[model samples]
Target chain A: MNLEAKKKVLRSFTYGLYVLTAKDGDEVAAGTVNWVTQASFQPPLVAVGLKRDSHLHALVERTGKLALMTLAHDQKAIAQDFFKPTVREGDRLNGHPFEPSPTFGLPLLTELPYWLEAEVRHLYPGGDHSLVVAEVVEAGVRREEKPLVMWDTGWFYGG
Target chain B: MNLEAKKKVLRSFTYGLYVLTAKDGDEVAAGTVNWVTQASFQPPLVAVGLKRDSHLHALVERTGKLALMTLAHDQKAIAQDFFKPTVREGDRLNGHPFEPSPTFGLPLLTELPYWLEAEVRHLYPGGDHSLVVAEVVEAGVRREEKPLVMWDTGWFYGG
Candidate 1:
């Protein structure tokens, strides 16, 4: 596909911004991500496209575990904050406080209402993003509200 | 993952409901879908978790062609209409009208704001769903608007 066609077409697909965190040994990584979806049902699987060579990918590469959090409709500011470099301020990540998920000890951005810790079960290679197929091991919910989506923020990713 | 935890956490992941159409010769299939996400950027690829025994899957399997349409916020009724069995009436599909995509001759569900036609490039096995990875070939837009989403409709699919 031509660049313009590819760009517009791919942008039309929907996504929700997520806070993904991974930690291994002393290395820690977290960022805002949009490429994620449920790929299986029986065993409950998820497919996440991690940017190649990204710090978040590096942490998951070594630890094989990560946690994902969903932001509510009012949380677009939080999404863009983590979209930049991760600045650790004590127990805070990108100016937001977080605690560790029980399963893998990955950071759970405490502000988000829903989160899950998962272990990578399969890895597949894409051009710019690596597909991380994972099984949810532990998950929790603090509250429920309309979650934020990529279209709502007028920001494009994965295209 | 426990059923309740899995259900809640998975539901938190955001999604936009889409109209998917596939036609193999005289055989026709179209419906509403949610388990879709972009998996690559350079080549502009998308991964769709199709139900195993779905009529839509059978058509895609044989024809390797499918088209996706993004629903406008007010089109939840349209999405639910296609969620059930497909009924073709003259040039209309279900109760809404549709046209054929230029690239693959798949139904465009013309009422939608954006549509893309793709050909399957890779396939992977998921538990109750099969991952159909396709590259966008041809696409167009009618009008730009906030697209409809799964959470907005209070319905769930995919784990």
Candidate 2:
């Protein structure tokens, strides 16, 4: 088994960019995540893979709530902004228009075309990362626009 | 919860289409899946959601080995072919070129740009679907091309 081949094959798997936000009391955390997908339909569940020790993971684990914003096709910079090291008390949004979601009070970007709030239903260990399975309890559409895909920005994160 | 709103927001999440194949003895199964993501970087773990009673799911459960093929963007028709009901004894490939993987002996589609073999590391119930966590042990690249994304073909599968 060639290690290089494995990395290349895993990188070939496509994905979209998303801003995952979570809140714990007055503290908030946001991060860029590409490994998110709708895992089920009936109860409307979405699965997100996050770094095991990331601040965003801690916030979600503490509050059991998360909000996801679909970055537009031209918003590659926004994704990069959140990819940096998290500053627990700093404003991660960088002046972007955002407000707490009505349902879960998680941060939602007003400019993004789509956003959803979910409650963490399960958490499981996945090697260096942890899988957070959440149920979409509320959602809102802000506008109409194509989403930014990981490949479109020439960014590779898998493997 | 507003079901339509949830559906729309969940649909906003982007994904790539792939053929997930598993075999048990002489019985083989393949199905189109879009709910696949790399869950871990260190161990090269991948998470795929399959319908609870799908033949492919059963085979993966029984054999503990699985193969994945990243479909090209032009292969929407091929993805649709396996989206139908699975026939237990019949060959689902029809006439597509496929061969047993060298590592796991699972069926792999040769026409796809990338393919990988994995061993089931864990399995959990995920609402209407079952989450299969597999560690990629072998991978090969056939060619280079843009993968088929779920939205590129105007097909909606989640929420």
Candidate 3:
């Protein structure tokens, strides 16, 4: 495979940015993820490719739960904040106000417009990342608005 | 779970449309898919959610190989053609012109801008669709044009 060609074509696979947060016991993980998409509509599943060695992966492995929230189209700064190192203090995560979701007890962003609570169904293996296939058990909408997309920021994830 | 809110929020997850084609022996399949994303960069992997009982799923299961091509921003018509009932007459697929990809020998759309060939490494069980984790082995670029996105077509794929 031509490495350059591979990189260019893979970038063509567009994506949206979402904040994936998890809270298992006292351990919590929050960060931005673009390698996520709906896997099934019948059982309502969402597939997320998370770094296997990350703290987020460990929490999901333990509790098999995650909360994914959509970012507003103009909220590039929010995506940047979550992607950075996260710090949890009291009811705040990454210095942002949030509340534990009712279903999975995962961190739910207060500013995000949409939220989906899921429970892990399968953990598929990938190279450096692992595919977390979760079934959507509950969902809520904070407001109606266009969700943020990777293209809007010109910041690419996978190459 | 609020079914209405689930549908609205899941739709917020953006995606790009691509023509996914596969061929194994005498069996061949071609169609449009939006549930595809780069899973890992280190080993160069892609995750595609294919319906469990579709012909496309069967071919991918048989050969463990698929060729995905990016539709140009102005080629929504091309995406529609592949999604419709495909007819393989001689070398034509879905009444559109295509040639077999070099490495995977899968149908490659003639007018697409980018192409990637992948070999399935794992198939994780999903509800109605299965999560196919494939490693990208070969790639090509027909042009530097921008790719088409699902949001542009105003068509929602997942609930």
Best by DockQ: 3
Q: Could you tell me which residue pairs clash in candidate 2?
A: none
Error (Å) of candidate 2 at residue B102 is 1.7
Candidates 1 onward: DockQ, in order: 0.59, 0.79, 0.86
Candidate 3 stretches with Cα past 4 Å from truth are: none
Worst-scoring 10-residue span by lDDT in model 2 chain B: B86-95
Which of candidates 2 and 3 reaches a greater TM-score? 3
Measured with C-alpha atoms, the lDDT of residue B11 in candidate 3 is 90
Model 1 iRMS: 1.9
Per residue, candidate 1 scores C-alpha lDDT tens digits across A54-149 of: 999888877789898988989999998987878789899889999988867888999998898888887777657777888888888888777888
Ranking by lDDT: 3, 2, 1
Model 2 over residues A96-147: C-alpha lDDT tens digits? 6678899877778777888999988888887889888998888887776888
RMSD (Å) of each candidate, 1 decimal: 2.2, 2.1, 1.2
Candidate 1 lDDT (Cα, 0 to 1): 0.83
Q: What TM-scores do the predictions have?
A: 0.91, 0.94, 0.97
Candidate 1 to native Cα RMSD, angstroms: 2.2
True contacts kept of 1: 0.68
Task: Give residue A5's error in model 3 in angstroms.
Answer: 0.7
Residue pairs in collision within model 1: none
